[PDB]
Specification:
The complex is a heterotetramer, with 1 copy of chain A (289 residues), 2 copies of chain B and 1 copy of chain C (359 residues).
Chain A lengths: L1 E2 L6 E2 L2 E2 L2 E2 L2 H13 L22 H10 L20 H7 L4 H21 L9 H23 L17 H7 L2 H16 L5 H12 L10 H22 L6 H6 L2 H21 L6 H6 L1
Antiparallel strand pairs in A: 1-2, 3-4
Chain B lengths: L1 H5 L3
Chain C lengths: L13 E2 L2 E2 L2 H11 L23 H11 L23 H4 L10 H15 L4 H9 L8 E3 L3 H4 L10 H24 L9 H20 L3 E2 L2 E4 L4 E4 H4 L6 H16 L5 H12 L11 H21 L6 H28 L8 H7 L4
Parallel strand pairs in C: 3-6
Antiparallel strand pairs in C: 1-2, 4-5, 5-6
Classes of the chains: A mainly alpha (289), B mainly alpha (9), C mainly alpha (359).
Bound molecules: ligand PLB, (9cis)-retinoic acid and zinc ion (4 copies).
The site of one zinc ion has 7 residues of chain A, from helix 2.
Chain C binds a DNA duplex (20 and 20 nucleotides) through strand 1 and helix 1.
PDB class: transcription/dna
Keywords: DNA-binding, Host-virus interaction, Metal-binding, Nucleus, Receptor, Transcription, Transcription regulation, Zinc-finger, Activator, Diabetes mellitus, Disease mutation, Obesity, Phosphoprotein, Transcription-DNA COMPLEX
Assembly: hexameric
DNA sequence: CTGACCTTTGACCTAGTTTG
DNA sequence: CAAACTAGGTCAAAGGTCAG
């Protein structure tokens, strides 16, 4: 004895939390099931009538939300070795004015990386399109993780692969002593006091590589999938290589936040030194930015 | 480019 | 209390020779009291609460597998509900809960309980409301600028700036609720007060989102103890700067929820966030790391069993942590550019406290 | 510093 | 895509079963 | 018999199918 709170038709009862017609009921259902995303051509003010309800999907679904049509009430459609990521291979691939000093290195290592990447299992097999999207996203983090590890021995600085230290006071001079020190204690201080296994550093950089959230993926799943493997291979590698350290896998993953945080605050400076024209930069770097 | 190029093989 | 032998969720009793859910019950009867024949299936469809109505042939199969039988309808009232009250099966309570795999199961419980008291609206009441499988009045919805007009919600004690402020409030309100929960973490009230603070100064943020992702869903967020519901579209349509504030959060929300964690877990995970030894400006760290390890050990177990089926969830869950930083650090970047090209910051002191000099 | 008033 | 028409689910209530 | 429980039954609300 009711009417659809959305358009006016004869509601056949309550559907997903409101009185409504088979029409609106079923429309709300597919939008949810399929995860469609509508848009309004005109100005999100389209009237929803028993006659012109199919006039605009965006404004229609939006009214459903207004009359409180709970999307969560819609149910799921009623149908349907640990070395799949050879830890070995990973380790193998893993074997291959200061602001300028830095940059001159970044570039050198920017070409190397690709080699490292192509040498990571499954990676290459991915759609060339995705291979780019991927490298574009984490190159920042990737590079920091590497040199951050190489600097385990040094005292108050970092190495660049081309054998040139860069101690604290020196970065402070360039006016980057903070982000710098952050690198020193949120990464180096940590990795060192943990004797970070190269293989482990291998897996981490790989997990960083396989970021399924990067925008523009021909298939996120494939990537989530790939990363999840490394979670296994790496979990196993730890289960074995370090039986006395229960939560090593955990404390090893908890390195990632610090890395992203710093990585972000790093592109901060880059874009800045760039536009400013501050010191010379190289072609590959410019491409990334 | 510089990357797409290098990632062409 | 007791789980269902077939699909898993809470069982309504011992039915047809086995403890099963009301759903699995009716299924079993409808089946044989009509001698039905569902299409075959070579796929050993694992039947689970979430996706149980996917395949009948398998749901019926598991039924029989666990004992569903009309030759066991054991009517009436139960004699020694204690022989079976041996903690259902004390075959773990004293056999599986060890060596120290019982403190973990106790710490979880401790945290969970402490969690229940500190936070008024858990995720359970939230998901209850959202799915309608509740009992209270449907939430009023704020979808228009008009719907807003009709907007009065009891927040404990322009238009965009008005909404944002509402946020401010709850944020503060929760920076408190969280504070308490912290005190309740084993060994927290101990560590150097200087660090204790530092750990909240940073923890709060990351905790909020997490919290605020139970109140959230693809289409909107819950407001005022969950009595109100604001659409993700309304918020997305505010004045230049303000229209984006809430998006990142919704984004994180969708991804995080895919995990399907329950309060039993957010209680442990929430803790794992505060007690972190990688915060900037910490003094004595060994003792912090010290606890975190324990909790983590707790958490992994918690999951491993609470969510048996899923895989790497634990590794995955931890992952989100790198995602929460990404937000906080960025979210702040906005707070900068905002205070700049805008007056009437009208920022609450407590927040002013925790925002001043972060990442 | 305001936090102090909460934990203390 | 839509929605009219039609089949399952399963939260809850009736009638009947064992204890104690 | 009161207390403590469970097959069955029921009907709103879900789900699904397939002309149009
Ligand atoms: O942003 C939040 N809440 C709100 C935001 C806007 C709002 O809207 C509003 N604001 C000002 C005036 C009218 N309406 C109400 C709330 C609420 O929790 O009630 C929030 C913050 C932290 C946490 Cl833990 C949870 C929420 Cl729901
Ligand atoms: C690290 C760092 C910076 C530079 C750029 C980034 C993000 C990475 C460089 C990597 C290198 C140089 C790697 C290698 O040698 O392999 C800036 C100038 C902002 C300040 C100090 C910290
Ligand atoms: Zn309708
Ligand atoms: Zn429209
Ligand atoms: Zn069941
Ligand atoms: Zn099946």
């Amino acid at each position: 004895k009711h009417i659809c709170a959305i358009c006016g038709d004869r509601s056949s009862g309550k559907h997903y939390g409101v009185y409504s017609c088979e029409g609106c009921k079923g429309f709300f259902k597919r939008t949810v099931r399929k995860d469609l995303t509508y848009t309004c051509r005109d100005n999100k003010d389209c009237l929803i009538d028993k006659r012109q309800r199919n006039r605009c999907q965006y404004c229609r679904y939006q009214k459903c939300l207004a009359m409180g049509m709970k999307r969560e009430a819609v149910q799921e459609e009623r149908q349907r070795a640990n070395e799949d990521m050879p830890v070995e291979r990973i380790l193998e691939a893993e074997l291959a004015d200061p602001v300028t000093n830095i940059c001159q290195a970044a570039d050198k290592q920017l070409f190397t990386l690709v080699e490292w990447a192509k040498r990571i299992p499954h990676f290459s097999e991915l759609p060339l399109d995705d291979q780019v999207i991927l490298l574009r996203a984490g190159w920042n983090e990737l590079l920091i993780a590497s040199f951050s590890h190489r600097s385990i021995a040094v005292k108050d600085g970092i190495l660049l692969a081309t054998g040139l230290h860069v101690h604290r006071n020196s970065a402070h001079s360039a006016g980057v002593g903070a982000i710098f020190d952050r690198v020193l204690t949120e990464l180096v201080s940590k990795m060192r006091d943990m004797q970070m296994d190269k293989t482990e550093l291998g897996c981490l950089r790989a997990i960083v590589l396989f970021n399924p959230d990067s925008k523009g993926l021909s298939n996120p799943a494939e990537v989530e999938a790939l990363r999840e493997k490394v979670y296994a291979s790496l979990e196993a590698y730890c289960k074995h290589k370090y039986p006395e350290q229960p939560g090593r896998f955990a404390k090893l993953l908890l390195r990632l936040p610090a890395l992203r945080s710093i990585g972000l605050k790093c592109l901060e400076h880059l874009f800045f030194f760039k536009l400013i024209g501050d010191t010379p930069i190289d072609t590959f770097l410019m491409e990334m930015l | 480019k510089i990357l797409h190029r290098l990632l062409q093989d | 209390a007791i789980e269902c032998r077939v699909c898993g969720d809470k069982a309504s009793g011992f039915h047809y020779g086995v403890h099963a859910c009301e759903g699995c019950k009716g299924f079993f009867r409808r089946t044989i009291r009509l001698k039905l024949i569902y299409d075959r299936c070579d796929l050993n469809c694992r039947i689970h609460k979430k996706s149980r109505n996917k395949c009948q042939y398998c749901r019926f199969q598991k039924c029989l597998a666990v004992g569903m039988s009309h030759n066991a309808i054991r009517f009436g009232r139960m004699p020694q509900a204690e022989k079976e009250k041996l903690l259902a099966e004390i075959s773990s309570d004293i056999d599986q809960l060890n060596p120290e795999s019982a403190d973990l199961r106790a710490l979880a419980k401790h945290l969970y309980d402490s969690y229940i008291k500190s936070f008024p609206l858990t995720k359970a009441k939230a998901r209850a409301i959202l799915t309608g499988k509740t009992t209270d009045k449907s939430p009023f919805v704020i979808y228009d600028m008009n719907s807003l007009m009709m907007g009065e919600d009891k927040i404990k004690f322009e238009v965009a700036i008005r909404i944002f402020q509402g946020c401010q409030f709850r944020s503060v309100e929760a920076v408190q609720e969280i504070t308490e929960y912290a005190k309740s973490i084993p060994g927290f009230v101990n560590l150097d007060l200087n660090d204790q603070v530092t750990l909240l100064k940073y923890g709060v943020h990351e905790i909020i989102y997490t919290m605020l992702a139970s109140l959230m869903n693809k289409d909107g967020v819950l407001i005022s103890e969950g009595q109100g519901f604001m659409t993700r579209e309304f918020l997305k349509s505010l004045r230049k700067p303000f229209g984006d504030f809430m998006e990142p959060k919704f984004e994180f929300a969708v991804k995080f929820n895919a995990l399907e964690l329950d309060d039993s877990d957010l209680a442990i995970f929430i803790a794992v966030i505060i007690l972190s030894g990688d915060r900037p400006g910490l003094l004595n760290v060994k003792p912090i790391e010290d606890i975190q390890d324990n909790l983590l050990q707790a958490l992994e177990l918690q999951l491993k069993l609470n969510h048996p089926e899923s895989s790497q969830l634990f590794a995955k869950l931890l992952q989100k942590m790198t995602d929460l930083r990404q937000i906080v650090t960025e979210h702040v970047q906005l707070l900068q550019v905002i205070k700049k090209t805008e007056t009437d910051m009208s920022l609450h002191p407590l927040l002013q406290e925790i925002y001043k000099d972060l990442y």
